[PDB]
Design a protein around this nucleic acid. Structure first.
Ligand SMILES: [Mg+2]
Lengths: 346, 211, 210
DNA sequence: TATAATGGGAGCACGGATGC
DNA sequence: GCATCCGTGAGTAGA
C-alpha cells in the first residue's frame, strides 16, 4: 500500500557488503571494464556495443532495447550475432568475455547492495519540491554513476566516493525539476544565494531588508534594480484551483477573464469596419480601389510593392503610385463630407 | 595478488596450494563441471540438460540452471534454476489480456451458466456480460492498458498571466510534469541498465503517476 | 471500478490485480517447466519475491566465519542439510560449499634431497624404499651416530625428524638424515670434528610422517 | 571527484453492491 | 448472512 515502506523492504532483502566483498565486486567491475576495452581492441568492434551485449546476456532477454549512443538498433538478432562473434574467439581472447560478464554481474550486485546509502542521504532533502521516492531514484542514478567511476586502488570505502555523486545527483534533480517554470541551475543558485543573503540580513537587522540593503550585502555588481528583477524572475505561479472563500464552492480561476478571444463587441466592430471600408471603396473606380486593396493587403492578406501592382495592372510604378494617391485623396474628400469612418479611429 | 607489486605473494619454489581460514563459506545448490579445455558457455547463460558446457562437447549439463564460469577453480558451475517468464505490472497484465480469445471464454462461461450452483451461475453471468460487451463493441480488452497517454490541449489547462503580472496555472500541468519526469527517468534508467529493484520502483512510481 | 473489468476478464481478485500491477508479486506467463515445493508451476500463478528469486536465480546462502577459526569442510565439497560447515556454523541447505576470502594461504613446497646415515648392520632392516612411519631399524642398545666429516653444523628441524648439514666454507661437505627416535646432540652453528657424535639412536627408529 | 557515512515520518451518515 | 469498500448528502447571491 505505502510505496516507501515496500521499497524499504525490497532494499532490506539485499545484505550489506563486508570490506572484502565490496573490494572484490569493485575489482571485478574495474577489470571488467578493462576486459571490454581489450575485447574492443581484438574484435575491432565498438566498446559500447560489446558492453551492451554482455549486459544484455547478464540481465537476460527480459530487457532488450535500442540505446541512444549505439549506431545499430539492439535486438535479439544483433546481440546473438555479436555474442557468436565473441564466442568465436580463441581461448586466451575468449577469457576477457568471461571477465566482462562477471564484471557486469558484480556491478549489478554492487549497486543493489549500496541502495540503502541513497535512502539515508535522500531523507534529508525532503520538502525541496521533490517527493521522497523521487529523491531516492535520483540518488540511485548518482549511485550508479559512482559505481561506474569508482577506483578501489585508492583504498577508500565505496560509501565515501558514492556519497558525493548521490548528493550531486539529488541537488541537480531538485534544481532541475522543482519549479513549474524551469530556471537554469546557475540562476537557481543565484536566487538561493539571494535568499540566504536576505535571511542573514533579516536575522541581523531584526526586520526584513530592503532591496538596497540586499544589494549592498551581495557585493559589487548588484543594485536594487537587479535584486528586484531577480526576485521577480524567481516568482512561482499560483494554482487556478486555489479555493477562494472557505468552502467547497469556488475556484480562483473562475474569476479570471479571457483576454484572448474577441468579445462580441469586438467582432461586431471589425465586421462593421470591413463593411464600411468596402462601402467607402465602392465610391471609387474598380482599378484604384483594387490598387488600394492590393497595397494595404485587403485582397490576399499581404501588401504589394508599387512594382507588383504596377506589373499587375500593366503600368509604371509612378503611375500606380499616382493612382494610389488620387484614390486616397478621393477617399479623404468622401470622408470629410460624410464623416462615416471617423468613429472607427478610436 | 594485491594493490601494489611489493605486497604480492609469489611462489618461491615448486609446491601445492592450500586455502585455510576463509572469511565466510557460501553454500550454493549447484552442479560442478571441471574443464580441461576451452569452455563453450559464458557466465550468466541459462542451460538445460544435455547442453554442451566445455571441452568441445565432452562435458555437458545434468540439471536446469544458470552458468557461472569459474576461471580460478577452473570449473563450470551450474546453479539450479529455470528460464521461467514471470512478470510484474501492467506489462504482464496487458500481455495476458492480449492472449485472450473472447469467443472461447464465452463458450466456457456458457458451460458455467448451466451449473446447478447459483453462485457459480452468478459469477459466470457477470463475467459473460463483460466478455459479450467487448465482443459486441469490438473493443480489444488490452486497450484497458495504456501505452500512449493522451495529453489535453494547453488552452484547457492554461498557463496565464493575471492582472498583477503573475502566473496562474491548472493542476493538470503539474500532474503531467510528474508523469513526464518519471517516464523519462525510467527510459534513462533502462538505457543505462540499472538493476531490477531500481527499475521496479521506477515503474511503480510511473503507474502511480498515471493514476 | 468494482468489480474490476480487467479482474473480471482475467479471473483475478482485486487483491491479486493490485499485487501484480503495483509490483508486490510476480505472475507466470510461461512456466518453462518450473517446480516449486513439489508442484509444477502453473500458468497465471502468483509468486512472491522469494519464490520467484528461488525459481529464477537459484538457492544459496553465505555463512560468516569467526576470526582465527578454520573451516571443517573442504573447498568445492558437496554438503548435506544439517551438516556442520564449521564449529560455529550449520548449513541450512544441500550443495557445493565455496570458500569466501581465505585469509591464510598455506603452500607446501616440494623438496627432493639426498642424505646419508650410518647404522649397525644387525639393527637395519633391508628395504629398497621406505614409506613414512615405516620402521627403518631397531637398536638393541643405545647407539651413537658419528660425524664422518669436519665443519660447521646447519640443523634443519622438520615436524618430526631432522636434517643435519655439515659445511666447510660455503659448500656443504656432508648431509645426514635423522629419523624419529634419534636425538641430535648438536645445535645450529656448532663446530664438529670427525668421530664426534652428532646424534643418539635409542631403540626403534622410524621414518617421519611428513 | 575519494576519511566514513547504508531501512521514512507523520496522523459522520446511511444504502448498496461485493467479498469471504 | 455479517465483515469489508465506496459514493453522496437543495438553490441563487457573495468572496
Ligand atoms: Mg552592491
Amino acid at each position: 500500500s505505502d510505496p516507501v515502506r515496500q521499497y524499504l523492504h525490497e532494499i532490506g532483502q539485499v545484505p550489506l557488503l563486508t570490506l572484502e566483498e565490496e573490494v572484490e565486486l569493485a575489482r571485478k567491475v574495474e577489470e571488467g571494464m578493462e576486459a571490454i576495452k581489450k575485447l574492443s581492441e581484438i574484435t575491432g568492434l565498438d566498446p559500447d556495443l560489446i558492453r551492451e551485449v554482455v549486459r544484455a546476456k547478464i540481465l537476460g532477454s527480459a530487457r532488450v532495447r535500442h540505446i541512444p549512443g549505439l549506431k545499430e538498433t539492439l535486438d535479439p538478432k544483433t546481440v546473438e550475432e555479436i555474442d557468436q562473434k565473441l564466442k568465436s574467439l580463441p581461448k586466451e581472447h575468449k577469457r576477457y568475455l568471461h571477465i566482462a560478464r562477471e564484471g557486469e554481474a558484480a556491478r549489478q550486485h554492487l549497486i543493489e547492495a549500496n541502495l540503502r546509502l541513497v535512502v539515508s542521504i535522500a531523507k534529508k532533502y525532503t520538502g525541496r519540491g521533490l517527493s521522497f521516492l523521487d529523491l531516492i531514484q535520483e540518488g540511485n542514478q548518482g549511485l550508479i554513476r559512482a559505481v561506474e567511476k569508482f577506483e578501489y586502488k585508492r583504498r577508500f570505502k565505496f560509501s565515501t566516493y558514492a556519497t558525493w555523486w548521490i548528493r550531486q545527483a539529488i541537488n541537480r534533480a531538485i534544481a532541475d525539476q522543482a519549479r513549474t517554470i524551469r530556471i537554469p541551475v546557475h540562476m537557481v543558485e543565484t536566487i538561493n544565494k539571494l535568499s540566504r543573503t536576505a535571511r542573514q540580513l533579516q536575522q541581523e537587522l531584526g526586520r526584513e531588508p530592503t532591496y538596497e540593503e540586499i544589494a549592498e550585502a551581495m557585493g559589487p555588481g548588484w543594485d536594487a534594480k537587479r535584486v528586484e528583477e531577480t526576485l521577480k524572475i524567481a516568482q512561482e505561479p499560483v494554482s487556478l484551483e486555489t479555493p477562494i472563500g472557505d468552502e467547497k464552492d469556488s475556484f480562483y480561476g473562475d474569476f479570471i477573464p479571457d483576454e484572448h478571444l474577441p468579445s462580441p463587441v469586438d467582432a461586431a466592430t471589425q465586421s462593421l469596419l470591413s463593411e464600411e471600408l468596402e462601402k467607402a471603396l465602392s465610391k471609387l473606380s474598380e482599378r484604384e480601389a483594387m490598387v488600394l486593396k492590393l497595397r494595404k493587403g485587403l485582397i490576399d492578406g499581404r501588401e504589394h510593392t508599387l512594382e507588383e501592382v504596377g506589373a499587375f495592372f500593366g503600368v509604371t510604378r509612378e503611375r500606380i503610385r499616382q493612382i494610389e494617391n488620387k484614390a486616397l485623396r478621393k477617399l479623404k474628400y468622401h470622408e470629410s463630407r460624410t464623416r462615416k469612418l471617423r468613429d472607427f479611429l478610436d | 595478488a594485491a594493490i601494489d607489486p611489493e605486497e604480492e605473494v609469489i611462489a618461491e619454489a615448486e609446491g601445492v596450494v592450500h586455502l585455510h581460514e576463509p572469511a565466510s563459506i557460501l553454500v550454493v545448490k549447484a552442479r560442478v563441471y571441471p574443464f580441461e579445455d576451452d569452455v563453450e558457455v559464458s557466465t550468466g547463460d541459462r542451460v538445460a540438460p544435455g547442453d554442451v558446457l566445455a571441452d568441445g562437447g565432452k562435458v555437458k549439463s545434468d540439471v536446469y540452471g544458470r552458468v557461472e564460469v569459474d576461471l580460478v577453480r577452473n570449473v563450470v558451475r551450474v546453479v539450479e534454476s529455470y528460464d521461467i517468464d514471470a512478470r510484474m505490472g501492467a506489462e504482464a497484465i496487458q500481455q495476458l489480456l492480449k492472449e485472450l480469445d473472447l469467443e472461447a471464454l464465452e463458450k466456457e462461461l456458457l458451460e458455467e451458466m448451466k451449473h446447478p450452483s447459483r453462485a457459480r451461475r452468478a459469477k459466470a453471468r457477470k463475467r459473460l456480460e463483460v466478455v459479450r460487451a467487448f465482443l459486441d463493441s469490438g473493443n480489444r480488452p488490452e486497450w484497458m492498458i495504456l501505452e500512449a497517454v493522451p495529453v489535453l490541449p494547453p488552452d484547457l489547462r492554461p498557463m496565464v498571466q493575471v492582472d498583477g503580472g503573475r502566473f496562474a496555472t491548472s493542476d493538470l500541468n503539474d500532474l503531467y510534469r510528474r508523469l513526464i519526469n518519471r517516464n523519462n527517468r525510467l527510459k534513462k534508467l533502462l538505457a543505462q541498465g540499472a538493476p531490477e529493484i531500481i527499475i521496479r520502483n521506477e515503474k511503480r512510481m510511473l503507474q502511480e503517476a498515471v493514476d | 471500478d468494482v468489480p474490476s473489468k480487467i479482474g473480471t476478464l482475467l479471473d483475478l481478485s482485486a487483491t491479486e490485480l493490485e499485487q501484480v500491477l503495483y509490483f508486490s508479486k510476480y505472475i507466470v506467463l510461461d512456466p518453462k517447466g518450473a517446480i516449486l515445493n513439489g508442484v509444477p508451476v502453473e500458468k497465471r500463478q502468483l509468486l512472491t519475491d522469494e519464490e520467484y528469486r528461488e525459481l529464477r536465480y537459484g538457492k544459496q546462502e553465505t555463512y560468516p566465519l569467526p576470526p582465527g577459526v578454520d573451516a571443517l569442510v573442504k573447498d568445492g565439497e558437496e554438503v548435506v542439510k544439517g551438516q556442520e560447515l564449521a564449529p560455529g556454523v550449520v548449513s541450512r541447505l544441500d550443495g557445493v560449499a565455496l570458500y569466501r576470502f581465505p585469509r591464510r594461504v598455506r603452500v607446501e613446497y616440494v623438496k627432493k634431497e639426498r642424505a646419508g646415515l650410518r647404522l649397525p648392520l644387525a639393527a637395519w632392516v633391508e628395504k629398497e624404499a621406505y614409506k613414512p612411519g615405516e620402521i627403518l631399524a631397531e637398536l638393541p642398545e643405545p647407539y651413537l651416530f658419528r660425524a664422518e666429516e669436519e665443519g660447521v653444523v646447519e640443523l634443519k628441524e622438520l615436524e618430526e625428524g631432522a636434517f643435519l648439514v655439515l659445511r666447510r666454507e660455503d659448500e656443504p661437505v656432508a648431509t645426514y638424515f635423522l629419523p624419529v627416535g634419534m636425538t641430535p646432540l648438536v645445535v645450529h652453528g656448532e663446530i664438529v670434528e670427525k668421530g664426534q657424535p652428532l646424534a643418539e639412536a635409542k631403540g626403534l627408529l622410524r621414518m617421519p610422517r611428513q
